[PDB]
Amino acid sequence: YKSITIATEGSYAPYNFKDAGGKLIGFDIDLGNDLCKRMNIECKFVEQAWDGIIPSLTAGRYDAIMAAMGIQPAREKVIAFSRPYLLTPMTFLTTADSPLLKTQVAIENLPLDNITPEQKAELDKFTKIFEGVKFGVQAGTSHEAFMKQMMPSVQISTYDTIDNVVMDLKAGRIDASLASVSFLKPLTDKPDNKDLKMFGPRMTGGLFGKGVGVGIRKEDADLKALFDKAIDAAIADGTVQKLSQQWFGYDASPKQ
Ligand SMILES: NCCC[C@H](NCC(=O)O)C(=O)O
Ligand SMILES: [Cl-]
Ligand SMILES: [Cl-]
Numbered sequence: 001y002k003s004i005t006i007a008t009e010g011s012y013a014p015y016n017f018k019d020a021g022g023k024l025i026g027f028d029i030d031l032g033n034d035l036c037k038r039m040n041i042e043c044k045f046v047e048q049a050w051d052g053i054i055p056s057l058t059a060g061r062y063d064a065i066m067a068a069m070g071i072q073p074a075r076e077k078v079i080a081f082s083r084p085y086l087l088t089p090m091t092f093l094t095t096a097d098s099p100l101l102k103t104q105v106a107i108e109n110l111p112l113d114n115i116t117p118e119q120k121a122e123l124d125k126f127t128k129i130f131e132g133v134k135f136g137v138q139a140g141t142s143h144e145a146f147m148k149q150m151m152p153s154v155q156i157s158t159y160d161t162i163d164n165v166v167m168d169l170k171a172g173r174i175d176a177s178l179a180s181v182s183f184l185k186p187l188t189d190k191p192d193n194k195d196l197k198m199f200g201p202r203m204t205g206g207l208f209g210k211g212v213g214v215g216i217r218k219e220d221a222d223l224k225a226l227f228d229k230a231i232d233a234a235i236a237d238g239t240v241q242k243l244s245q246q247w248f249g250y251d252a253s254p255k256q
């Protein structure tokens, strides 16, 4: 490898989005360029809609995916992943005036890898509270997968982009959403969004998988080996931590 093409969504701030000049910016872009410098490879970022981001990788339209993509078991059946470059729990989003905010959280950190009757009881409590509540999620996400598999009795609307989800929540067309803390914290930290609040347990594992990684074709074992060495070095020297604070306003970097 001398040169690779990396796909990103271009509409998932602060991971990947467009600046005032329409240039691709974000945590994914800065990290991607940093990892490619360590691998001594020419880096080109391209914009790709979330819908066909995985089949365009397997079809050879580009060489990698850096688009806030969770290393989830369903995706591992189709593509390979690098080592996680970011770890993030998942939580719920609603309006600041919502009665949903007064709900008691019995389990602050909820792992989904081996759901106990206690963990299931907490999941069922939230499922029953979310009955009658209109939920909105971006289509093709682990957020949609969680709602369909874990909370099927909850009415959900799916969207092309996360920006349309946020728009409809602020407009009052939906009552709640679900995304990672890495997306929801910088969003709710904005003075623009003081009318929006995070709530409920912070969930990890299960269908959400084990962090955010680089999507690579399964046959490209050498490119994965290069990315894994570059990510381990970027984590060790504190580059991931620095970019996490810069873009997310907190440290979401993994530990060695
Ligand atoms: N359109 C990007 C959504 C990415 C999503 N990752 C969760 C998240 O980082 O909020 C997923 O893996 O499904
Ligand atoms: Cl966004
Ligand atoms: Cl081809």
Ligand SMILES: [Cl-]
Residues within 6 Å of the ligand: 065, 066, 067, 068, 069, 070, 212, 213, 214, 215
């Ligand atoms: Cl990614």
Ligand SMILES: [Cl-]
Residues within 6 Å of the ligand: 096, 097, 098, 099, 101, 102
């Ligand atoms: Cl309230």
Ligand SMILES: [Cl-]
Residues within 6 Å of the ligand: 101, 102, 103, 104, 105
């Ligand atoms: Cl509370």
Ligand SMILES: [Cl-]
Residues within 6 Å of the ligand: 136, 137, 138, 141, 143, 144, 162, 165, 177, 178, 179
């Ligand atoms: Cl979503």
Ligand SMILES: [Cl-]
Residues within 6 Å of the ligand: 153, 154, 155
């Ligand atoms: Cl329903």
Ligand SMILES: [Cl-]
Residues within 6 Å of the ligand: 158, 159, 160, 161, 164
């Ligand atoms: Cl939409």
Ligand SMILES: [Cl-]
Residues within 6 Å of the ligand: 094, 095, 098, 174, 175, 176
């Ligand atoms: Cl609401």
Ligand SMILES: [Cl-]
Residues within 6 Å of the ligand: 091, 092, 198, 199, 200, 201, 202
């Ligand atoms: Cl929370």
